[PDB]
């Protein structure tokens, strides 16, 4: 709505957007900011303290989760 106090999310997001529009995800990640961001994501789902707007806008711009944990229960 407003600036707020997430001014780096919404960079992030942007950057990640577009970084997204060009390789969908980077499964290597050695782009720093966004290489960082997603080291710290990691423990953000696996806690689950990962909120499902954040993780409905990178899926809306194509960022794909995979299945990197391979065990379904359904």
Known sequence: MNQNLQGEWMKNYEELKSFV?????????????????????????????LPNDRRLLLDKIGFVWSLEHHHHHH
Not at 25 to 47: A, D, I, V
Request: aromatic fraction near 10%.
């Open 21 to 49: 529009r060009k390789y969908r995800r980077f499964p290597k990640s050695t782009e720093g900011n966004l290489g960082g961001w997603c080291h710290t994501q990691r423990k953000m789902r696996k806690q689950g303290k």
